[PDB]
Amino acid sequence: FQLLESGPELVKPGASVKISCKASGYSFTDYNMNWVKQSNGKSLEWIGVINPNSGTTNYNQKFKDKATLTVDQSSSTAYMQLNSLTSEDSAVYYCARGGGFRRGFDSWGQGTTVTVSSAKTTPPSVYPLAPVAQTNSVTLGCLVKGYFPEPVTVTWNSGSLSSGVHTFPAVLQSDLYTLSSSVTVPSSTWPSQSVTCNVAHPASSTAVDKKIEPN
Amino acid sequence: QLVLTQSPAIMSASPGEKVTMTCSASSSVSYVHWYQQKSGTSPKRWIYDTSKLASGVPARFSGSGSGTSYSLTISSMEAEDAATYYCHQWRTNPPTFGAGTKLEIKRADAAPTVSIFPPSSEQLTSGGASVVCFLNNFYPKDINVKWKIDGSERQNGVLNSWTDQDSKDSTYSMSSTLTLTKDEYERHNSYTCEATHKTSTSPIVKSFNRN
Ligand SMILES: COc1cc(S(=O)(=O)O)c2ccc3c(S(=O)(=O)O)cc(S(=O)(=O)O)c4ccc1c2c43
Which of B49, B80, B107 is the last residue of a domain? Predict the structure, then answer.
């Protein structure tokens, strides 16, 4: 039993979007489908529920004319359509299978991240972070700045099997995201062995590699 | 609607320590559901019908309550349980969730390993100059940082970002980025990163000079 949702979406304010939820492994028509909104990782807001067998809907009064729930019994797929989108609607939306009375939401899709903004897709600018003190270990980093939208994936490749890596959440400055990633390796490995940060931005279809160099 | 209030909002606990978190209802209900969520993933049904444990959840967990008072209990905390937990009710339309109880794991304190990085010549040639300061591996989360130029303090033009509790050593980390243009960085020479943490009264200081 698993639910797959459509990929992330960047949309202009005022426009609409339609999220899909492909069920599998169970009788799609026998279990209701609920939709949940999670704004910036905090609380959970219940949007509505649909009966896939009968197609009858029940919406949260806060989401009457914001969300429209439909279903395709043919392809065992639930749908949620969001209209008149604003920055307030930018969030992660989940479809969760209603397991029945006194059973709760017993299955959740991976979620879909929608972004409502006027900013255009921009690839990242990557800058190396190398030390210009001598100690036991060495910490390096890469600064990812000027990209949009989220997210990005930084992967380090060094000549050492130990990698104290830290990924810092992105912060929004000048209407564009900025991220930092750090790595800690033994001193005897760098710069005696190449260290590279691989920044992947799928939204712009760009992967940038930076070899860290001494100063 | 019917409001759910979870307490505490955030808490810590050591391995083997017993944990309990409450879910209060603005009016009497008959049962609640508990959902576990870890960073960057979807909520999972953890406990349903107040007391029933889902498939594959450890026996350490348990749930009880009635009316307006409900609670989730862990007999012996483990690192696997560090996550946020929401309660859920549907006694009346619409259903509601609690604000959540972020359950972190407790460990011994640690001082932050600090490292400063000047603007790369690459960024300089692009009309920018960002100086970075990594405050890695410290506990607890609470920390403060300040930037100084030749001894003079500089507020704002700074961004800070905290990482979630690391899954391997249960520590925290934060990055501090003082962003300038080029000539704004070209005036002064010495740039200093000063960090203040609960562990020590004296701040941890790393710095550099342009030349
Ligand atoms: C007034 O309480 C209502 C009402 C509906 S409704 O949408 O059919 O009005 C419900 C519709 C669906 C419910 C569902 S499910 O079918 O999506 O698993 C579960 C639950 S429960 O809290 O797990 O019992 C509910 C508990 C209470 C519920 C409802 C459910």
Answer: B107
